[PDB]
Amino acid sequence: SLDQCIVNACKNSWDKSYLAGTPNKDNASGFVQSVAAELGVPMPRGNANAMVDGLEQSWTKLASGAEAAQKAAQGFLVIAGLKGRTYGHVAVVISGPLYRQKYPMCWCGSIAGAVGQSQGLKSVGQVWNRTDRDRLNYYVYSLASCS
């Protein structure tokens, strides 16, 4: 699996602060901004909702969580995102066996504390709730980031 540079980018972004005085681990949008900046990949800017709008307008959309993990394994940056009426949430998908045989492993910060966060050991079906887990969108950047 060729996702090592993305995993590293996540680890490195975890202690950074894209926003002044705001550790990425407590800020979903910021966290993926730092991941993207570290991989030389243009990321739509803004809060989670704004980012999902931009990803929807300009990025490739994948069919499943399985296709998402596959794309991570091939070295592509993959964002799982979902708008909310109030606030959305985004996360970086990484390679690894699918949780409940459906949902890919991920990294994500969250203002919600530990229950919202993941350091690669929670899947998207353990960050997002039971109903939301099945509504996620998966976006992949058009060029691979890992050689």
Side-chain angles (χ1 to χ4, degrees), residues 6-47:
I6 289 143
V7 176
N8 288 344
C10 293
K11 286 191 185 188
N12 287 334
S13 295
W14 186 260
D15 299 290
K16 285 180 147 118
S17 295
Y18 174 76
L19 268 193
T22 312
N24 283 341
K25 55 188 174 70
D26 295 309
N27 176 15
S29 53
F31 174 83
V32 340
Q33 292 301 333
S34 290
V35 176
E38 186 164 329
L39 304 161
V41 167
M43 186 60 57
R45 289 152 180 178
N47 61 25

Short mmCIF file of all heavy atoms in Angstrom, two decimals, residues 6-47:
data_model
loop_
_atom_site.label_atom_id
_atom_site.label_comp_id
_atom_site.label_asym_id
_atom_site.label_seq_id
_atom_site.Cartn_x
_atom_site.Cartn_y
_atom_site.Cartn_z
N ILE A 6 0.62 10.15 2.90
CA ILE A 6 -0.62 10.73 3.39
C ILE A 6 -0.76 10.50 4.89
O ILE A 6 -1.12 11.42 5.63
CB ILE A 6 -1.84 10.16 2.66
CG1 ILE A 6 -1.87 10.67 1.22
CG2 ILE A 6 -3.13 10.55 3.38
CD1 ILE A 6 -2.37 9.66 0.23
N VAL A 7 -0.47 9.28 5.34
CA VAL A 7 -0.47 8.99 6.77
C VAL A 7 0.49 9.92 7.50
O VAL A 7 0.13 10.52 8.51
CB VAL A 7 -0.09 7.54 7.06
CG1 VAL A 7 -0.03 7.30 8.55
CG2 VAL A 7 -1.10 6.61 6.42
N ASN A 8 1.70 10.07 6.97
CA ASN A 8 2.68 11.00 7.52
C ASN A 8 2.17 12.44 7.54
O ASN A 8 2.38 13.17 8.51
CB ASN A 8 4.00 10.93 6.73
CG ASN A 8 4.78 9.65 6.98
OD1 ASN A 8 4.52 8.93 7.95
ND2 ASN A 8 5.74 9.36 6.11
N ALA A 9 1.50 12.84 6.47
CA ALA A 9 0.96 14.18 6.40
C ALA A 9 -0.08 14.38 7.50
O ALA A 9 -0.16 15.45 8.09
CB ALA A 9 0.36 14.45 5.03
N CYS A 10 -0.87 13.35 7.78
CA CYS A 10 -1.86 13.39 8.84
C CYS A 10 -1.20 13.51 10.20
O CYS A 10 -1.55 14.39 10.99
CB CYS A 10 -2.72 12.13 8.82
SG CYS A 10 -3.81 11.94 7.38
N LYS A 11 -0.25 12.61 10.48
CA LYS A 11 0.50 12.65 11.74
C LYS A 11 1.10 14.02 11.97
O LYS A 11 0.94 14.59 13.04
CB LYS A 11 1.62 11.61 11.74
CG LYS A 11 1.18 10.17 11.93
CD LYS A 11 2.38 9.27 12.19
CE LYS A 11 2.00 7.80 12.26
NZ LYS A 11 3.14 6.95 12.72
N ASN A 12 1.76 14.57 10.95
CA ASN A 12 2.34 15.90 11.03
C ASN A 12 1.33 17.02 11.23
O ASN A 12 1.61 17.98 11.92
CB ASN A 12 3.19 16.22 9.80
CG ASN A 12 4.49 15.47 9.78
OD1 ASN A 12 5.03 15.10 10.82
ND2 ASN A 12 5.01 15.25 8.58
N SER A 13 0.17 16.91 10.59
CA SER A 13 -0.82 17.97 10.71
C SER A 13 -1.54 17.96 12.06
O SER A 13 -2.08 18.98 12.48
CB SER A 13 -1.85 17.88 9.59
OG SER A 13 -1.22 18.12 8.33
N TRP A 14 -1.52 16.79 12.71
CA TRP A 14 -2.24 16.58 13.96
C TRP A 14 -1.89 17.57 15.08
O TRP A 14 -2.74 17.91 15.90
CB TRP A 14 -2.08 15.14 14.45
CG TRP A 14 -2.92 14.82 15.64
CD1 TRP A 14 -2.52 14.78 16.95
CD2 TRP A 14 -4.33 14.53 15.64
NE1 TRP A 14 -3.58 14.46 17.76
CE2 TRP A 14 -4.71 14.31 17.00
CE3 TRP A 14 -5.31 14.42 14.64
CZ2 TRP A 14 -6.02 14.00 17.37
CZ3 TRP A 14 -6.61 14.11 15.02
CH2 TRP A 14 -6.96 13.91 16.37
N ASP A 15 -0.65 18.04 15.10
CA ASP A 15 -0.22 18.96 16.14
C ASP A 15 -0.04 20.39 15.63
O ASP A 15 0.35 21.27 16.39
CB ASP A 15 1.08 18.46 16.77
CG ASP A 15 0.91 17.10 17.41
OD1 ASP A 15 0.23 17.04 18.46
OD2 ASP A 15 1.45 16.10 16.87
N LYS A 16 -0.33 20.60 14.35
CA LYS A 16 -0.26 21.93 13.75
C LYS A 16 -1.53 22.74 14.05
O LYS A 16 -2.50 22.20 14.58
CB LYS A 16 -0.03 21.82 12.24
CG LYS A 16 1.39 21.43 11.84
CD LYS A 16 1.55 21.35 10.33
CE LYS A 16 2.94 21.77 9.91
NZ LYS A 16 3.66 20.69 9.24
N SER A 17 -1.52 24.03 13.71
CA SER A 17 -2.71 24.86 13.84
C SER A 17 -2.85 25.68 12.59
O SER A 17 -2.18 26.69 12.43
CB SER A 17 -2.63 25.79 15.05
OG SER A 17 -2.60 25.03 16.24
N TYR A 18 -3.72 25.23 11.70
CA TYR A 18 -4.04 26.00 10.51
C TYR A 18 -4.61 27.38 10.87
O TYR A 18 -4.27 28.38 10.23
CB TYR A 18 -5.00 25.21 9.61
CG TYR A 18 -5.47 26.01 8.43
CD1 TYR A 18 -4.65 26.23 7.33
CD2 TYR A 18 -6.75 26.55 8.41
CE1 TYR A 18 -5.08 26.96 6.26
CE2 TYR A 18 -7.17 27.29 7.34
CZ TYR A 18 -6.34 27.49 6.28
OH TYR A 18 -6.80 28.23 5.23
N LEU A 19 -5.47 27.44 11.89
CA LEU A 19 -5.96 28.70 12.44
C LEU A 19 -5.21 29.05 13.71
O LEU A 19 -5.04 28.19 14.59
CB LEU A 19 -7.41 28.58 12.86
CG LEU A 19 -8.53 28.93 11.93
CD1 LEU A 19 -9.81 29.00 12.77
CD2 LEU A 19 -8.22 30.22 11.24
N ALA A 20 -4.82 30.31 13.82
CA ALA A 20 -4.17 30.84 15.01
C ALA A 20 -4.79 30.34 16.32
O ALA A 20 -5.99 30.46 16.53
CB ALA A 20 -4.21 32.34 14.97
N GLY A 21 -3.97 29.75 17.19
CA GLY A 21 -4.44 29.26 18.48
C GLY A 21 -5.50 28.17 18.42
O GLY A 21 -6.33 28.06 19.31
N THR A 22 -5.47 27.36 17.38
CA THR A 22 -6.49 26.34 17.22
C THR A 22 -5.85 25.09 16.66
O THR A 22 -5.74 24.94 15.43
CB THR A 22 -7.61 26.80 16.27
OG1 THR A 22 -8.04 28.12 16.63
CG2 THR A 22 -8.80 25.83 16.30
N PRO A 23 -5.40 24.21 17.56
CA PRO A 23 -4.82 22.92 17.19
C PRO A 23 -5.73 22.18 16.20
O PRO A 23 -6.95 22.16 16.38
CB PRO A 23 -4.71 22.18 18.52
CG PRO A 23 -5.50 22.98 19.50
CD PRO A 23 -5.46 24.38 19.02
N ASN A 24 -5.13 21.62 15.15
CA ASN A 24 -5.89 20.95 14.10
C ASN A 24 -6.75 19.83 14.65
O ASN A 24 -7.82 19.56 14.14
CB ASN A 24 -4.96 20.41 13.00
CG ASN A 24 -4.47 21.50 12.06
OD1 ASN A 24 -5.05 22.56 11.98
ND2 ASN A 24 -3.40 21.22 11.33
N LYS A 25 -6.27 19.18 15.72
CA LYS A 25 -6.99 18.06 16.32
C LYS A 25 -8.36 18.48 16.84
O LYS A 25 -9.23 17.62 17.05
CB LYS A 25 -6.17 17.42 17.44
CG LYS A 25 -5.71 18.38 18.53
CD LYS A 25 -4.73 17.68 19.49
CE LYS A 25 -4.14 18.65 20.51
NZ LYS A 25 -5.13 19.13 21.54
N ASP A 26 -8.56 19.78 17.03
CA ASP A 26 -9.83 20.34 17.47
C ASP A 26 -10.56 21.11 16.37
O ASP A 26 -11.45 21.92 16.66
CB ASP A 26 -9.60 21.26 18.65
CG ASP A 26 -9.11 20.51 19.86
OD1 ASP A 26 -9.74 19.50 20.22
OD2 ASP A 26 -8.07 20.91 20.44
N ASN A 27 -10.17 20.85 15.12
CA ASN A 27 -10.68 21.61 13.98
C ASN A 27 -10.61 20.82 12.66
O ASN A 27 -9.60 20.84 11.96
CB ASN A 27 -9.92 22.93 13.87
CG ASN A 27 -10.33 23.74 12.65
OD1 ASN A 27 -11.35 23.47 12.01
ND2 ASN A 27 -9.53 24.74 12.31
N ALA A 28 -11.71 20.14 12.33
CA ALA A 28 -11.78 19.26 11.16
C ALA A 28 -11.26 19.90 9.86
O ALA A 28 -10.33 19.36 9.18
CB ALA A 28 -13.22 18.79 10.98
N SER A 29 -11.85 21.05 9.51
CA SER A 29 -11.47 21.77 8.30
C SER A 29 -9.98 22.12 8.28
O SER A 29 -9.27 21.81 7.31
CB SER A 29 -12.36 23.02 8.10
OG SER A 29 -12.39 23.87 9.24
N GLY A 30 -9.50 22.72 9.36
CA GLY A 30 -8.10 23.05 9.50
C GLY A 30 -7.20 21.84 9.31
O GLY A 30 -6.23 21.90 8.54
N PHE A 31 -7.52 20.75 10.01
CA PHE A 31 -6.74 19.53 9.88
C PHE A 31 -6.57 19.11 8.41
O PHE A 31 -5.41 18.88 7.95
CB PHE A 31 -7.33 18.38 10.71
CG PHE A 31 -6.64 17.06 10.48
CD1 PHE A 31 -5.47 16.75 11.16
CD2 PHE A 31 -7.14 16.15 9.56
CE1 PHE A 31 -4.82 15.53 10.94
CE2 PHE A 31 -6.49 14.93 9.33
CZ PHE A 31 -5.33 14.62 10.01
N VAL A 32 -7.66 19.03 7.64
CA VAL A 32 -7.43 18.61 6.25
C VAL A 32 -6.70 19.66 5.41
O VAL A 32 -5.97 19.31 4.47
CB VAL A 32 -8.65 17.95 5.51
CG1 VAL A 32 -9.69 17.43 6.47
CG2 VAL A 32 -9.22 18.87 4.49
N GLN A 33 -6.87 20.94 5.75
CA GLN A 33 -6.09 22.00 5.11
C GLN A 33 -4.59 21.76 5.28
O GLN A 33 -3.83 21.87 4.32
CB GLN A 33 -6.43 23.38 5.68
CG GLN A 33 -7.82 23.87 5.36
CD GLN A 33 -8.08 23.99 3.87
OE1 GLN A 33 -7.16 24.18 3.06
NE2 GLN A 33 -9.35 23.87 3.49
N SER A 34 -4.17 21.43 6.50
CA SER A 34 -2.76 21.16 6.73
C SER A 34 -2.26 19.89 6.00
O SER A 34 -1.18 19.91 5.39
CB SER A 34 -2.45 21.10 8.22
OG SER A 34 -2.54 22.39 8.78
N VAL A 35 -3.05 18.82 6.06
CA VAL A 35 -2.73 17.63 5.26
C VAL A 35 -2.48 17.96 3.77
O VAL A 35 -1.44 17.60 3.18
CB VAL A 35 -3.84 16.56 5.42
CG1 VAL A 35 -3.60 15.34 4.52
CG2 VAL A 35 -3.96 16.16 6.90
N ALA A 36 -3.43 18.70 3.18
CA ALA A 36 -3.38 19.12 1.79
C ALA A 36 -2.17 20.00 1.48
O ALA A 36 -1.48 19.79 0.49
CB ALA A 36 -4.66 19.84 1.43
N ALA A 37 -1.94 21.00 2.34
CA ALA A 37 -0.80 21.91 2.17
C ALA A 37 0.51 21.11 2.21
O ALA A 37 1.46 21.44 1.52
CB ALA A 37 -0.79 23.01 3.23
N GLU A 38 0.54 20.06 3.03
CA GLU A 38 1.76 19.29 3.15
C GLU A 38 1.98 18.37 1.95
O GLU A 38 3.11 17.98 1.65
CB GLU A 38 1.75 18.47 4.44
CG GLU A 38 3.07 17.76 4.68
CD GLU A 38 3.21 17.28 6.10
OE1 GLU A 38 2.65 17.95 7.01
OE2 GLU A 38 3.87 16.22 6.29
N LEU A 39 0.90 18.02 1.25
CA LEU A 39 1.04 17.16 0.07
C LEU A 39 1.06 17.91 -1.28
O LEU A 39 1.00 17.30 -2.34
CB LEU A 39 -0.07 16.10 0.05
CG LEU A 39 -0.20 15.21 1.28
CD1 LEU A 39 -1.59 14.58 1.32
CD2 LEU A 39 0.90 14.14 1.30
N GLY A 40 1.14 19.24 -1.22
CA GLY A 40 1.08 20.07 -2.41
C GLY A 40 -0.22 19.94 -3.19
O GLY A 40 -0.22 19.98 -4.43
N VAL A 41 -1.34 19.79 -2.47
CA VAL A 41 -2.65 19.58 -3.10
C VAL A 41 -3.63 20.73 -2.79
O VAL A 41 -3.93 20.98 -1.63
CB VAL A 41 -3.26 18.23 -2.66
CG1 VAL A 41 -4.74 18.15 -3.03
CG2 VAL A 41 -2.48 17.06 -3.26
N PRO A 42 -4.14 21.41 -3.84
CA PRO A 42 -5.06 22.53 -3.65
C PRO A 42 -6.36 22.08 -2.99
O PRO A 42 -7.01 21.16 -3.49
CB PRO A 42 -5.35 23.02 -5.07
CG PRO A 42 -4.33 22.38 -5.94
CD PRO A 42 -3.93 21.11 -5.27
N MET A 43 -6.73 22.71 -1.89
CA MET A 43 -7.93 22.34 -1.16
C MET A 43 -8.87 23.54 -1.12
O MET A 43 -8.44 24.64 -0.75
CB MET A 43 -7.54 21.96 0.28
CG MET A 43 -8.68 21.41 1.13
SD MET A 43 -9.42 19.90 0.44
CE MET A 43 -8.02 18.80 0.30
N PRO A 44 -10.14 23.35 -1.52
CA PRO A 44 -11.14 24.41 -1.31
C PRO A 44 -11.10 24.89 0.15
O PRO A 44 -11.05 24.06 1.06
CB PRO A 44 -12.47 23.70 -1.60
CG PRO A 44 -12.12 22.58 -2.51
CD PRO A 44 -10.72 22.15 -2.16
N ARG A 45 -11.10 26.20 0.37
CA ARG A 45 -10.93 26.79 1.70
C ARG A 45 -12.28 27.05 2.38
O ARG A 45 -13.31 27.12 1.71
CB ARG A 45 -10.16 28.11 1.60
CG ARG A 45 -8.69 27.96 1.25
CD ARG A 45 -8.16 29.20 0.51
NE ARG A 45 -6.74 29.04 0.17
CZ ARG A 45 -6.01 29.93 -0.50
NH1 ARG A 45 -6.56 31.06 -0.92
NH2 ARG A 45 -4.73 29.68 -0.75
N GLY A 46 -12.27 27.22 3.70
CA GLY A 46 -13.47 27.55 4.44
C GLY A 46 -13.79 26.54 5.52
O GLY A 46 -12.97 25.67 5.83
N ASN A 47 -14.97 26.66 6.12
CA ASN A 47 -15.41 25.66 7.08
C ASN A 47 -15.83 24.37 6.35
O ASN A 47 -15.87 24.33 5.12
CB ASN A 47 -16.50 26.19 8.02
CG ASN A 47 -17.77 26.63 7.29
OD1 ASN A 47 -18.07 26.17 6.19
ND2 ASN A 47 -18.53 27.52 7.92
#
